[PDB]
């Protein structure tokens, strides 16, 4: 089975990508597993915002890396190859893995 | 380099 790991910072974008991937899968092949949402990584950062000194002065940023696990149960001839053509939205790292 | 072009080939052979 083809496991697909979508990773992105924007959630909407990721969602869009996932849908597209599903569409790509579903026309060619059959029995797409589904878009399973894994836990989001909220990598936080604190920094001092003064140039020199004021320690209680701080900004707390974060990067929300979202995960989408799409799986394809039956890899056909037509389906797997299709991925190459269907181009998705930018800033979405995909990671397909057969078996 | 015979007919009307003999003047052209005179010119090209002169300008080398």
């Amino acid at each position: 089975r083809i496991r697909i790991r979508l990773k992105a910072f924007d959630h909407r974008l990721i969602d869009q990508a996932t849908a597209e991937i599903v569409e790509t899968a579903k026309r060619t092949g059959a029995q797409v597993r589904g878009p399973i949402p894994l836990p989001t990584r909220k990598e936080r950062f604190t920094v001092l915002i003064s140039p020199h000194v004021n320690k209680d002065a701080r900004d707390q940023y974060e990067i929300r890396t979202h995960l989408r696990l799409v799986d394809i149960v039956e890899p056909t001839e037509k389906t797997v190859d299709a991925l190459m053509r269907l181009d998705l939205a930018a800033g979405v790292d995909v990671q397909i893995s057969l078996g | 380099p015979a007919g009307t072009g003999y003047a052209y080939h005179q010119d090209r052979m002169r300008r080398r």
């Binding site: 909220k42 001092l48 915002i49 707390q60 974060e62 890396t65 | -």
Partner: protein, 100 residues
């Protein structure tokens, strides 16, 4: 930071890049309990001979824009101050102010 400091850092990095294979090997030799004493000694001495800037524990992480040694962050390669600026500008992807 100064230009000079930056240059020095760069040099150190270069040295590290150069001498990694040898240094690592030497370290391994020194560690290896199943080895001769004399050999070990030689290795230890050999290491000394190699340049100091060849060590990776010599090089300090500075900001990639300003060269500021302190307040550094690894993910961004930038000092706090610059990082913040980047965030504000939209230049770091995904990064926004966090509240919870």
């Amino acid at each position: 930071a100064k230009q000079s400091m930056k240059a020095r850092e760069v040099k150190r990095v270069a040295l590290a890049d150069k001498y990694f294979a040898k240094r690592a090997e030497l370290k391994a030799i020194i560690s290896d309990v199943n080895a001769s004493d004399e050999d070990r000694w030689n290795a230890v001495l050999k290491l000394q001979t190699l340049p100091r800037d060849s060590s990776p524990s010599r090089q300090r992480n500075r900001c990639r824009q300003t060269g500021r040694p302190h307040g550094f962050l690894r993910k961004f390669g930038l000092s706090r101050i610059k990082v913040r600026e980047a965030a504000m500008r939209g230049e770091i992807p995904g990064l926004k102010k966090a509240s919870w």
